[PDB]
Amino acid sequence: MAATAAEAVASGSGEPREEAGALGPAWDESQLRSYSFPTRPIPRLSQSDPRAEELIENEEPVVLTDTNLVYPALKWDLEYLQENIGNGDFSVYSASTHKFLYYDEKKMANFQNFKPRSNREEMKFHEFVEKLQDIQQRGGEERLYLQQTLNDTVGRKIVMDFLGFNWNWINKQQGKRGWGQLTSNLLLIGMEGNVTPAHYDEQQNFFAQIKGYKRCILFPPDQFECLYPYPVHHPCDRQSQVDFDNPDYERFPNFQNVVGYETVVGPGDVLYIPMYWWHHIESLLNGGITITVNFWYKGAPTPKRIEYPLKAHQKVAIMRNIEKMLGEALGNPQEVGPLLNTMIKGRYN
Amino acid sequence: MAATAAEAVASGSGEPREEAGALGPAWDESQLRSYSFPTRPIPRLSQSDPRAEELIENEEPVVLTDTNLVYPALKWDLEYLQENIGNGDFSVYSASTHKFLYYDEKKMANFQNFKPRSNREEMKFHEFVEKLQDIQQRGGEERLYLQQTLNDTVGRKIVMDFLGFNWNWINKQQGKRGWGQLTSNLLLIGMEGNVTPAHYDEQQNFFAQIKGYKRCILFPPDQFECLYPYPVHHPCDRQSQVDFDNPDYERFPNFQNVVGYETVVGPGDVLYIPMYWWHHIESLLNGGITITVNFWYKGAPTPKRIEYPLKAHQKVAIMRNIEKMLGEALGNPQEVGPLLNTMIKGRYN
Ligand SMILES: O=C(O)CC[C@@H](O)C(=O)O
Ligand SMILES: O=C(O)CC[C@@H](O)C(=O)O
Ligand SMILES: [Fe+2]
Ligand SMILES: [Fe+2]
């Protein structure tokens, strides 16, 4: 039966890997949250494996196990970073829930009836370690998540490690894919259980895991109709409106047909998250703090000639463009919805 | 009660006018078809009346009773035209119903599952008079409607009358409104009872009545949501999908809120039909053949600066543009609908 076969290939992250030296299972199923949709595993390969180069070339996710991309950072931890990252400001988000929904502050002007579930708070690294230390011993329920792009104000040793990254490998990837420039490197340090809701980015991304384990659930661009992203002008643009913990099938019927690709990444693994691919990221339950550094690259330039059929991500690009134009033409983003409905009601639906 | 007051101002074409010389009522209520919506009267004024100049300036319909625009043509009739219009080809549409829905043949390629309710048949004027004579005596049910733009192949006397038109008046109108060039002059000769379904044009129009009487029902551009025009790429683009004789309130709920402006025009009257205004035109029942000549003018150029709020017709222009672009981008007009739905479902509705 194809039914049974389907219930099998939907193995998710599969059997937990064993850490060398018989140090036991990296993690166990109970550390993963439970969702209503099925998921197939993302291929875990060697960077020397042609299949991996094949997946990246075809804009498909793949976990590279031996790139040594951020090898020098694998020694990183709270103590080390505090004594070497510098005294610059670090964006720290606090929240009353395990979900850290991303919001664009420049767009909070278009929607005043919008209040974020998490607030940003700038501070020095030692302060973050402090606020965190407080909560851990105070037994608080508050959750924190540090997300700061690595700037030119970081300490000497941190700059040293940075230089030790495997630029030879990634620079060749950048070149072979025709991608644009490296736009930034985001350092992420979250508490166990933390979750970054499903969303997509308009950048190519090499997601390098350093400390702790993270479960990454991706969805191809062609599942746009099942994930219902917020309006382009809304502050939560590119994020999914669907609450994965309590799906509202009445407002989002097609979320019942969603099928993901998941995997659990650990120290040393690099996950290629293709541009426009949706991704849900959560730090395993009771797994301790997690550390990650991403590498965002501008996508390759759109080809002078346009071949048909268009790819899923090209249609997503068109929809985004329409929403943006209409917002400018109407002189007000709030009127985008009414005009769109007027356009389709009784005409295209 | 505002209810009663509303039921009063909704007088439609009002009391039938009396023809000079005590020749009786021009027409009577029983010659008008019955519809499910209410209608207020269009102002019937003198071209010297400032109020008329006011309405035209504000892009609002008005019937001018004394322009003498097509004074020389008032003598026109089948016999005269046959002996003077020439031997060029005249587009003649035949149909099994009283409704002559307009269709764009260049767009019949995008929709193959579309078959017009009326067919075009080129012929010489004398042939049209023939086919018509046949039906009238044969007691046939077939209906004909001649619609041919006046070209440079018309007879001498017809050209004479043409020259006698009141160009002094209309040329000043064209100049005062900043309108573009005169694009064409359509000659319409239909059988009693004929109907041109509700639709709008992207041209300014001076509709000059010559023979017989016509009931014209207009709807302002802001009633777009109540009239459900076909998709822009469909051959019936700009026409209403709503069957005025048997409205489908299930597919077109807002047609229940539609409110029109009507009037009955006769020999000598000129009806200004502003650009984008919907219009329904029917030749009175048992009123004999009708003759009309319109004057289509390119609208004025869009102002360099755009003031807000936009006017209803500007939003209609934006919607049309979106449909067109999307059709080009997707490489196929048939995919416009699916993409639009994907865009709004669970996001803007
Ligand atoms: O690790 C996370 O919490 C999410 C990061 C992800 O959105 C990215 O683009 O790197
Ligand atoms: O007279 C008619 O049948 C309709 C003509 C009208 O659509 C016009 O644009 O002049
Ligand atoms: Fe992301
Ligand atoms: Fe028309």
Swiss-Prot record, chains A, B:
GO terms for biological process: negative regulation of Notch signaling pathway; negative regulation of transcription by RNA polymerase II; positive regulation of myoblast differentiation; positive regulation of vasculogenesis; regulation of vascular endothelial growth factor receptor signaling pathway. Its main location: nucleus. Residues 142-312 form the JmjC domain. The keyword rRNA processing does not apply. Its EC number is 1.14.11.30, 1.14.11.n4. Changing residue 201 to G: No impact on HIF1A Asn hydroxylation activity. Loss of Asp hydroxylation ability. Strongly stimulates 2-oxoglutarate turnover. Loss of HIF1A Asn hydroxylation activity and slight stimulation of 2-oxoglutarate turnover. The modification N-acetylalanine is found at residue 2. Residues 2-125 are annotated as: Interaction with VHL. Gene3D superfamilies: Clavaminate synthase-like, Jelly Rolls. The record marks 340 as: Important for dimer formation. GO terms for cellular component: cytoplasm; cytosol; nucleoplasm; perinuclear region of cytoplasm. Residues 1-51 are annotated as: Disordered. 2-oxoglutarate binds at residues 145, 196, 205, 214, 294. One of its GO terms (molecular function) is zinc ion binding. Fe cation binds at residues 199, 201, 279. The keyword Phosphoprotein does not apply. Its cofactor is Fe(2+). Coiled coil: none annotated. Transmembrane segments: none annotated. InterPro entries: Cupin_8, FIH-1_dom_II, JmjC_dom, RmlC-like_jellyroll. Substrate binds at residues 152, 181-183, 201-203, 238-239, 300, 321. It is found in: Nucleus; Cytoplasm; Cytoplasm, Perinuclear region. Homodimer; homodimerization is essential for catalytic activity. Interacts with VHL and HIF1A. Part of a complex with VHL, HIF1A and HDAC1 or HDAC2 or HDAC3. Interacts with NFKB1 and NFKBIA. Interacts with NOTCH1, NOTCH2 and NOTCH3 but not with NOTCH4. Interacts with APBA3; binding inhibits HIF1AN binding to HIF1A. Interacts with TNKS2. Interacts with PPP1R12A. Interacts with ASB4. Interacts with UBE3A. Interacts with ANKS3. Interacts with NECAB3; the interaction is indirect and seems to be mediated by APBA3. Hydroxylates HIF-1 alpha at 'Asn-803' in the C-terminal transactivation domain (CAD). Functions as an oxygen sensor and, under normoxic conditions, the hydroxylation prevents interaction of HIF-1 with transcriptional coactivators including Cbp/p300-interacting transactivator. Involved in transcriptional repression through interaction with HIF1A, VHL and histone deacetylases. Hydroxylates specific Asn residues within ankyrin repeat domains (ARD) of NFKB1, NFKBIA, NOTCH1, ASB4, PPP1R12A and several other ARD-containing proteins. This is Hypoxia-inducible factor 1-alpha inhibitor. It comes from Homo sapiens (Human). The gene is HIF1AN.
